[PDB]
Design an enzyme around this catalytic site. Structure first.
Site, PDB file in Angstrom:
ATOM      1  N   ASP A  81      80.960  83.326  99.604  1.00  0.00           N
ATOM      2  CA  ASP A  81      80.041  84.698  99.501  1.00  0.00           C
ATOM      3  C   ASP A  81      78.598  84.393  98.720  1.00  0.00           C
ATOM      4  O   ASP A  81      77.959  85.449  98.741  1.00  0.00           O
ATOM      5  CB  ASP A  81      81.080  85.732  99.179  1.00  0.00           C
ATOM      6  CG  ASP A  81      81.315  85.752  97.620  1.00  0.00           C
ATOM      7  OD1 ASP A  81      81.110  84.764  97.123  1.00  0.00           O
ATOM      8  OD2 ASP A  81      82.139  86.848  97.445  1.00  0.00           O
ATOM      9  N   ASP A 106      93.497  98.448  83.038  1.00  0.00           N
ATOM     10  CA  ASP A 106      94.741  98.777  82.632  1.00  0.00           C
ATOM     11  C   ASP A 106      95.825  97.790  82.304  1.00  0.00           C
ATOM     12  O   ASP A 106      95.558  96.596  82.500  1.00  0.00           O
ATOM     13  CB  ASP A 106      95.415 100.095  83.220  1.00  0.00           C
ATOM     14  CG  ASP A 106      95.296  99.541  84.567  1.00  0.00           C
ATOM     15  OD1 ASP A 106      94.897 100.179  85.479  1.00  0.00           O
ATOM     16  OD2 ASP A 106      96.109  98.479  84.984  1.00  0.00           O
ATOM     17  N   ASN A 147      83.865  86.106  87.633  1.00  0.00           N
ATOM     18  CA  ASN A 147      83.062  86.161  89.097  1.00  0.00           C
ATOM     19  C   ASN A 147      81.797  86.944  88.862  1.00  0.00           C
ATOM     20  O   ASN A 147      81.844  88.397  88.525  1.00  0.00           O
ATOM     21  CB  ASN A 147      83.876  86.582  90.139  1.00  0.00           C
ATOM     22  CG  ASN A 147      83.306  86.407  91.559  1.00  0.00           C
ATOM     23  OD1 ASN A 147      82.680  87.452  91.895  1.00  0.00           O
ATOM     24  ND2 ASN A 147      83.142  85.200  92.137  1.00  0.00           N
ATOM     25  N   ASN A 168      81.479  80.175  95.218  1.00  0.00           N
ATOM     26  CA  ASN A 168      82.211  80.521  96.409  1.00  0.00           C
ATOM     27  C   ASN A 168      81.287  80.788  97.903  1.00  0.00           C
ATOM     28  O   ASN A 168      80.210  80.715  97.691  1.00  0.00           O
ATOM     29  CB  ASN A 168      82.762  81.978  96.162  1.00  0.00           C
ATOM     30  CG  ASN A 168      83.626  81.912  94.809  1.00  0.00           C
ATOM     31  OD1 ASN A 168      83.425  82.463  93.863  1.00  0.00           O
ATOM     32  ND2 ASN A 168      84.933  81.151  95.033  1.00  0.00           N
ATOM     33  N   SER A 185      78.602  84.043  95.346  1.00  0.00           N
ATOM     34  CA  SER A 185      79.201  84.187  94.029  1.00  0.00           C
ATOM     35  C   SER A 185      79.736  83.133  93.444  1.00  0.00           C
ATOM     36  O   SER A 185      79.714  82.020  93.972  1.00  0.00           O
ATOM     37  CB  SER A 185      80.202  85.426  94.099  1.00  0.00           C
ATOM     38  OG  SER A 185      81.359  84.956  94.426  1.00  0.00           O
ATOM     39  N   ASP A 195      81.960  81.591  89.796  1.00  0.00           N
ATOM     40  CA  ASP A 195      83.199  81.762  88.793  1.00  0.00           C
ATOM     41  C   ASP A 195      82.600  80.980  87.850  1.00  0.00           C
ATOM     42  O   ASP A 195      82.456  79.978  87.766  1.00  0.00           O
ATOM     43  CB  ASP A 195      84.423  81.468  89.224  1.00  0.00           C
ATOM     44  CG  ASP A 195      85.017  82.084  90.644  1.00  0.00           C
ATOM     45  OD1 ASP A 195      84.816  83.302  91.100  1.00  0.00           O
ATOM     46  OD2 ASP A 195      85.448  81.432  91.299  1.00  0.00           O
ATOM     47  N   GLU A 207      92.573  78.562  85.742  1.00  0.00           N
ATOM     48  CA  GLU A 207      91.610  78.716  86.170  1.00  0.00           C
ATOM     49  C   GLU A 207      90.493  77.423  85.662  1.00  0.00           C
ATOM     50  O   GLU A 207      89.552  77.326  86.752  1.00  0.00           O
ATOM     51  CB  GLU A 207      90.975  80.000  85.690  1.00  0.00           C
ATOM     52  CG  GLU A 207      91.641  81.155  85.827  1.00  0.00           C
ATOM     53  CD  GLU A 207      91.415  81.429  87.564  1.00  0.00           C
ATOM     54  OE1 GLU A 207      90.646  81.116  88.057  1.00  0.00           O
ATOM     55  OE2 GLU A 207      91.954  82.506  87.971  1.00  0.00           O
TER      56      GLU A 207
END
Ligand code: NA
Ligand code: NA
Ligand code: NA
Ligand code: NA
Ligand code: NA
Length: 129
Positions: free
Chosen positions: A48, A101, A59, A46, A50, A52, A35
């Site tokens: 869109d 989870d 994000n 990004n 957004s 990171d 990453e």
């Protein structure tokens, strides 16, 4: 801050990521490598609108507020800038909230592609952890 591999592994261990929701420490180190290259200052914009942020490229559409991801959420209740700190607390706590989870690391595409189904123990080799 750019962490060393074992330096980050040790910090992540201290912060409780080893076997968190069944994910051994190497998973998290491997995700961070691919990453961010272990750089807390990593950012990626990004298409869109957004962004990171941080060692785990968390994000802004869902997890943090940067004030420029219109109509987004802040589930970690942090400014995204907190994810850029040499203090990995905010990134770890937010990563724990994402993985809620034991299939949770699927959230990270880099983990899926480079770490999932692999012997992640190599990520902590030589670290004495
Ligand atoms: Na630490
Ligand atoms: Na947001
Ligand atoms: Na910002
Ligand atoms: Na920073
Ligand atoms: Na790998």
């Amino acid at each position: 801050k750019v962490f060393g591999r074992c330096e980050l592994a040790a910090a992540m261990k201290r912060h409780g990521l080893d076997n968190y929701r069944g994910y051994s420490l190497g998973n998290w180190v491997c995700a961070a490598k691919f990453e961010s290259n272990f750089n807390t200052q990593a950012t990626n914009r990004n298409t869109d609108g957004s962004t990171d942020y941080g060692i785990l490229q968390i994000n802004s559409r869902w997890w943090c507020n940067d004030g420029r991801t219109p109509g987004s959420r802040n589930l970690c209740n942090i400014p995204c800038s907190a994810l850029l700190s040499s203090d990995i607390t905010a990134s770890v706590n937010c990563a724990k909230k994402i993985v809620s989870d034991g299939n949770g690391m699927n959230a990270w595409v880099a983990w899926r592609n480079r770490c999932k189904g692999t012997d992640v123990q190599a990520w902590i080799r030589g670290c004495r952890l």
